[PDB]
Amino acid sequence: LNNMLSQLGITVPTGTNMQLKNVAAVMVTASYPPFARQGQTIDVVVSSMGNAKSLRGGTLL
Amino acid sequence: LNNMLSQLGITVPTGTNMQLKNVAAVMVTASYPPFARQGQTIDVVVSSMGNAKSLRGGTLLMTPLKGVDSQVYALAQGNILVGGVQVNQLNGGRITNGAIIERELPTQFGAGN
Amino acid sequence: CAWIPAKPLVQGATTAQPIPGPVPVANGSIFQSAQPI
Amino acid sequence: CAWIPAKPLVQGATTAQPIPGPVPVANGSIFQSAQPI
Amino acid sequence: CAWIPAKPLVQGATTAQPIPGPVPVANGSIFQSAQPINYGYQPLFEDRRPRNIGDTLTIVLQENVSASKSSSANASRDGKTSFGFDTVPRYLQGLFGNSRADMEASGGNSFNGKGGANASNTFSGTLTVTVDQVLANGNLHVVGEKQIAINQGTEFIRFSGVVNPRTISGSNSVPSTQVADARIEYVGNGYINEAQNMGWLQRFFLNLSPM
Amino acid sequence: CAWIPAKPLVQGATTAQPIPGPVPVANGSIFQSAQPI
Amino acid sequence: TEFIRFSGVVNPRTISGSNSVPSTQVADARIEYVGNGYINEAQNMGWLQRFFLNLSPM
Amino acid sequence: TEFIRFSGVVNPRTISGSNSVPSTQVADARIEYVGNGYINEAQNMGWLQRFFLNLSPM
Amino acid sequence: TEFIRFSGVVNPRTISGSNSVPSTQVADARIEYVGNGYINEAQNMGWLQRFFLNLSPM
Amino acid sequence: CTITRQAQVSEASPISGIVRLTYNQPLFFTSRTDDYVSHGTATRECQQMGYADAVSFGQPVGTCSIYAGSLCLNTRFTLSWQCR
Amino acid sequence: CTITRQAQVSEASPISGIVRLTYNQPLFFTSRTDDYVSHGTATRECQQMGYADAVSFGQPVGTCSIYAGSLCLNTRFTLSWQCR
Amino acid sequence: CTITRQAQVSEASPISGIVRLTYNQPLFFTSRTDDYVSHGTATRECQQMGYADAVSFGQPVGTCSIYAGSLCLNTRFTLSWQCR
Ligand SMILES: CCCCCCCCCCCCCCCC(=O)O[C@H](CCCCCCCCCCC)CC(=O)N[C@H]1[C@@H](OP(=O)(O)O)O[C@H](CO[C@@H]2O[C@H](CO)[C@@H](OP(=O)(O)O)[C@H](OC(=O)C[C@@H](CCCCCCCCCCC)OC(=O)CCCCCCCCCCCCC)[C@H]2NC(=O)C[C@@H](CCCCCCCCCCC)OC(=O)CCCCCCCCCCC)[C@@H](O)[C@@H]1OC(=O)C[C@H](O)CCCCCCCCCCC
C-alpha cells in the first residue's frame, strides 16, 4: 500500500502505525487463452493471501 | 488532507492532533472507454482504503485518474451512491458520470486496409 | 597560496529560472496538460 | 610523491544518462511494453 | 572625534501630522467614506501569505552547519638479526674460527601522517523581508535588510533568497533553511569592526610568509 | 584595511515598492481578478 | 564569507513529506563548504611548507 | 576534497524496501575513499623514505 | 588498495535462504586478502634479512 | 572595461524543451552581446530539436566560475529559453 | 588549446540497445569532434547489431580519467545512443 | 604501444555450451585482434562440440594476471561465446 501511495505521489513516513482493515493482499490467477489478442479480456480468480476475513464487495486494483 | 489544505492556502502546523472522522481515504477506479473524448464523462467506483466504517453520503473531491503510465487521464469528483440477512457494501460506492476525461489516446483507426 | 584561482567542484549556475509553461488551449477545460515526458 | 598521475580503481564514467525509451504505439492501449530482455 | 558631523541612519522627520480628512457630503448619511486605496481581492480563510511585490515575510534564520574530516596513516617496520659463536670447534675453525661469520644488524622505518579539517557556523536571528518579484512558478524572491546602531558603530543584517509560497507556516514565517539562494550578511562598522581586521602587514605575512 | 571599498553579497535594493494594482472594471462585481500568472 | 554548495541527482520518489530528502539519497553528491578571508587564509599551509611536504625526503 | 566512489554488480532481488542494498551483497565491489590537498599529501611516505623502505636491508 | 578474492566450487544445495553459503561449505577454497602501497611494503622482510633468515646458520 | 560579446550555447535538453546559453564577464567588465543573437541561437537549437519559437521566459543568471581569494575573476551569465 | 577530435566507440550492448562512445580532453583543452561523426558511428554500431537509427537521447558526460594531485590531467567525455 | 594480437582459446565446456577465449595486454598496451578471428575460433570450438553458431553475447572482461607492487604488468581479457 505504501508503494502504491508513493507511486501515486504520496510518501508516508517509514515509521507510522498504518493499521487498516479495509484492504486485503490477494493473489490473482488467470488463464491466458490460445491466440490471445491485445485488446481482449479474460476472467480472473482473486484469493486472499494474509488473514483477511472476507472479500465480499472488494475491488481489485 | 494537510496537502490539500496547503494547496488551497492553509498551512496546518506539522505538530497537531488532526483527529477527524468525517473523511475517508479512498481509491477510485474507472474504465477509460475506447475513443474517449476530452469533454466526455465516465462512471467511477470509489472504495475505502483505511478503516472507514462507511461511505454512505460522502463526496469524492477532485481525484486525478491516471493510467499505467502515471499520466492523468481523468478528473473524478461528485457524490457517492451506496445501497441503503444480506447487508449492502457500505465501504464501496459508484459515481455516475463522476469522472471527466482529460486526455485522448491516439488510435490508428481509419488507417490501413 | 589561498589567492590562486580555483574552480569549485560544484561548477555551473546554482540557479534555475522557472519556465512559465504552455499557454492554455481554449478547449473549454480548466485542466491543462504539461507535455508528458 | 602525491602528484604522480594515478588511475582510480573505479575507472570510467560514474554517471549514466537515462534513456527516454520507446515512443508509444497507437494501438489504443495506455500500457506500453519496454522490450523484454 | 565625537563632534564630527554625522547623519543618523533614521533620516528624515520622525513625525507625521495627521490629515483632517475629507469634508462630509450632505447625502443624509452619517457614514462617510475615506477614499479607498486598494481594490484587490483578498481571501478570508487563507494564511495571508505574501503574494505581491510589496508583501512582507518573516524569516527565522535558525541556520546550523557543521562539517568534519579526519584521516590518518602509519607504517612501521623493524628488524634486527644476530649470530655469534663465542666458541668454535677445532674442526670448524676454518669457516667460523674468527668473527668471519659473526653478524649483527638492525633496521627501522617508522612513518606517521595525519590530517583533519572542521567547519561550523550558526545563526539564530529573525528578520522580516520584503518580496522582490514573483517568479513564473509562484516562488517569491525576498530581500530584506535591518540596521541597528547600538552605540559607536552600526550593524547591517541583510537576507536574500527565493521562497516557495507553500513553506510559509502560520504567522508568515519561514525558516531560513527552507529558502533557496540563501544570502545572509551580518556586517559591522566603526572602530569595533575595524579592530577585527588583521592589518595590512600581518595579512601580507599570512598570505606570503613561508610557514 | 577596513576602509577599502567592498560590495556586500546581498547586492541590489533591499526594498520593493508595492504596486497599486489594476483599476476595477465596472462589470458590477465587487470581486476583481489580479492577472493570473 | 562561507559558501555551501550542493549538486546532485534526486529521484522524485525519495522526497518525504515536507520536500526533504537526505543527502545520502542523492546521486552524484557534490558538496562544497568553503570559506574566504584571513580566517580561510590562516588554514593554508604556506608555499615553503607545502613544497617541503611534497618534496622533502621523510 | 574527498572522493568516495563505488562500483559493482547488484542482483535486482537483494534490494530491500527503500532501494537499499548492503555493499556485502554487491558483486565486483570496488570501493575508493581518496583525498586531496596537503592533508592527503601529509600521509604520503616521501620519496627517500619509500626508497629506503623498499630497498634498505632490514 | 586491498584485494579480497575468493574462488571455489559450491554445491547448489548448501545455499541457505538469502543466497548465502559459509566458506567452510565451499570446495577448493581459495581465499586471498592482499594489500598494496607503502603499508604493504612495510610488512616485507627486506632482501638482506630474508637472505639471512634463509641461509644464516641458526 | 564595459565591452563584451560572444554569447554561446551550453545546453539543449529536449526533455522540457530547454535551451541554455552562457557568456562570460571579466572581473571589472560588463556584457550584453546583442539581445538578438541569443534569440537566434535559441531558435536554431529549437528547430534542430523537435520544438521551435524559443522564448526567453526568464532573466540572466550570473554565477562566479573562477575564484581568487575574496574576488571573482570571471562570472558566467546564463540565458534560458523554452522551445514551443 | 581549444582543438580536439577523434571521438571513438567504447561500448555496444544489445541488451537495451545501448551504444557508448568516448573521447578525451586534455587539462586546458576543449573537444567537439564534428557533432555528426558520433551519430554515424552510433548508426553503424546499431546496424551491426539488430537495431538501427541511433538517437543521442542524452547529454555528454565528463569524468576525469587521470589524477595528478589536485588536478585533472585528462577528462573522458561519453556520448550515449539508444538504437531503435 | 597500441598494437596487440593473438587471441586464443582457453575453455570449452559442453555443459551450458560455453566457449571462452583469452588474450593478453601489456601494461601500456592495447589489444584488438581482428573482431572476427575470435568468432571463427568460437565457431570452430562449437562445431567440435555438439553445438554450433557461436554468439558473442557478452563484453570483454579484463583481470590482471601479473602483479608488481602497485601496478599491473599484464592484463587478461576474456571473450565468452554461447554455442547454439
Ligand atoms: C636460495 C639458495 C640458493 C643456493 C645458494 C648457494 C649457497 C650461497 C653461498 C652461501 C655460502 C657463502 C659463501 C662464502 C664464501 C664466498 O665465496 O663468498 C665470500 C663473500 C661472501 C659472498 C656471499 C654472498 C652470497 C649471496 C647470497 C646468495 C644466497 C642464495 C668471498 C670469500 O671467499 N671470502 C673469504 C676470504 O675473505 P677475504 O676477502 O677477506 O680475503 O678469505 C677468508 C679466509 O679464508 C679461509 O681461510 C681459512 C684459514 O685461514 C681456511 O681454513 P683452513 O682449513 O685452511 O685453515 C678457510 O678454508 C676452509 O673453510 C676449509 C674448508 C672447511 C671445511 C669444513 C666443513 C664445512 C662443510 C659445510 C657444509 C655446508 C652445508 C650447506 O672449506 C670448505 O670446504 C667449506 C665447505 C664447502 C661446502 C660446499 C657445499 C657442499 C654442498 C653441501 C650441501 C649439504 C646438503 C645437506 C678459508 N675459507 C674460504 O676461503 C671461503 C670458502 C672457500 C671455498 C672453497 C671450498 C669449496 C667451495 C665449493 C662450492 C661452494 C659454492 C657455493 O669457504 C666457504 O665458506 C664456502 C661455503 C660454501 C657453502 C655453500 C653451501 C651450498 C649449499 C647448496 C644449496 C644449493 C674467508 O674467511 C672468507 O670467507 C668467509 O669468511 C665465509 C665464512 O667463512 C663462511 C660463512 C658462511 C655463512 C653462510 C653464508 C650466509 C650469508 C647470507 C647472507 C647473504
Ligand SMILES: O=C(O)[C@H]1C[C@@H](O)[C@@H](O)[C@@H]([C@H](O)CO)O1
Ligand atoms: O689462512 C689465511 O688466509 C689467513 C688466516 C688469518 O690470519 C687471516 O686474517 C689472514 C691474515 O690476513 C694473514 O696475514 O691469513
